[PDB]
């Protein structure tokens, strides 16, 4: 089951390693350091989570078929109940924030229309598209001197 | 400084890159909720990044900056007793 599914996990490990450094820098507070460097080094390590989040969507047929938990062997007699909410995943408040995605879903919405309203959603996106080929088309429009020693070492040639 | 040219003309390329992927703000389930604040942060990040390269280059255009006389009283009072106490 998923001979190549583990090579996806080592790429979850490469992306998880983006958390490693990040969180050990959190504790590296409260003494202040290198906002530019860290911020860019935190942002850069975040992006890849989405790009391993991306390389997962090509494999999205196996998170749908889901490949799912045939997988639990160990018999961890109870104490894996914490590995059970852990194996469990499911949705956190982030779900409480998913319905905030549902009230941001706002209206809308179905029950709203069946089709021809939807075909006015797709015909609603596609016209945002053409405004962008009018965009790229107007874009290409404008597109003290060192201590004398080193100078005597420069009389030695030294730079 | 030929390196302010190489970085801040790669920052010019960055104003060029900053208008690129931002307006580029684009039109999966879990990851297409992802990419939608991914550019609110990384389009506007890089937007405060050329906003920061706006400031860096706004105020670093600035780093391109780099008597007892007592009037004539103690002047002409001792400008006489110098020369007329010189020859007389």
């Amino acid at each position: 089951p998923g001979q190549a599914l583990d090579a996806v996990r080592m790429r979850l490990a490469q992306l998880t390693h983006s958390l490693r450094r990040i969180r050990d820098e959190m504790s590296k507070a409260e003494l202040p350091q290198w906002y530019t460097l860290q911020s860019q080094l935190n942002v850069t390590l975040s992006q890849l989570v989405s790009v391993t989040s991306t390389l997962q969507h090509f494999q999205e047929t196996l998170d749908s078929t889901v490949v799912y938990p045939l997988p639990k062997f160990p018999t961890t007699s109870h104490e894996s109940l914490v590995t059970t909410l852990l194996r469990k995943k499911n949705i956190p408040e982030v779900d409480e924030w998913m319905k905030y995605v549902r009230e941001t879903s706002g209206v809308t919405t179905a029950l709203l229309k069946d089709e021809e309203i939807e075909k006015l959603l797709q015909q609603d996106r596609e016209i945002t598209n053409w405004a962008r080929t009018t965009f790229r088309n107007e874009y290409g429009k404008h597109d003290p001197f060192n201590v004398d020693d080193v100078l005597k070492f420069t009389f030695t040639g030294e730079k | 400084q030929a390196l302010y040219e190489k970085l801040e003309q790669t920052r010019t390329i960055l104003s060029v890159k900053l208008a690129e992927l931002i307006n580029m703000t684009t039109i999966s389930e879990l990851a297409v909720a992802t990419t939608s604040v991914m550019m609110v942060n990384n389009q506007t990040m890089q937007l405060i990044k050329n906003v920061q390269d706006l400031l860096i280059l706004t105020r670093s255009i600035k780093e391109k900056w780099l008597f007892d006389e007592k009037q004539i009283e103690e002047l002409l009072d001792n400008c006489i007793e110098t020369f007329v106490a010189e020859k007389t």
């Binding site: 989040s53 998170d63 799912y68 995943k89 | 990851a31």
Partner: peptide
């Protein structure tokens, strides 16, 4: 369903999303 273990690690993104956003202030 190997997807739902990754929707709570989508939720690992939000606490970094709002902690990165509350950093922005």
């Amino acid at each position: 369903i190997f997807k739902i273990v990754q929707s709570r690690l989508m939720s690992t993104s939000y606490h970094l999303n709002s902690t990165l956003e509350s950093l922005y202030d």
